[PDB]
């Protein structure tokens, strides 16, 4: 038993990173994340 092997960080890390990249919460949800519009400060 060694803690580093027991806990796998990319589970959480790459999980969230993935989700926000694709914006699919599951599909059970999609398009939740969207790249910001910098067209104009109003936009």
């Amino acid at each position: 038993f060694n803690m580093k092997l027991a806990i796998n960080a990319k589970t959480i890390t790459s999980g969230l990173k993935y989700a926000l990249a694709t914006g699919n919460w599951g599909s059970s949800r999609a398009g939740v994340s969207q790249v910001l519009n910098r067209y104009t400060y109003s936009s």
Binding site: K4, L5, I7, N8, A9
Partner: protein
């Protein structure tokens, strides 16, 4: 058996092909006589090993390039005679 296609200008024939290719017109033309050559140019053990290896490099936070170099390495060793053992822990490390 043969099957290799080469492009040659029947009117020039002077050299082997020296040509340019036009992607927009999707055609390929001899640069000399300006003739069109072509048209309509179109646009079990292992997997287990790489799985646990993947886990290890992951926990180690090594960048994918390192992970993949090690993967490549391990494939070359694989089942070879001279290794003759080491139980799969030594090889992964």
């Amino acid at each position: 058996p043969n099957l290799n296609i080469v492009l040659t200008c029947p009117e020039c024939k002077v050299y082997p092909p020296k040509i340019v290719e036009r992607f927009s017109e999707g055609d390929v033309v001899c640069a000399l006589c300006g003739l069109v050559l072509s048209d309509k140019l179109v646009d079990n053990e292992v997997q287990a090993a790489f799985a646990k290896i993947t886990m290890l490099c992951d926990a180690a936070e090594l960048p994918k390039i390192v992970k993949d170099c090690a993967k490549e390495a391990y494939k070359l060793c694989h089942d070879e005679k001279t290794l003759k053992g080491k139980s799969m822990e030594s090889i992964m490390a």
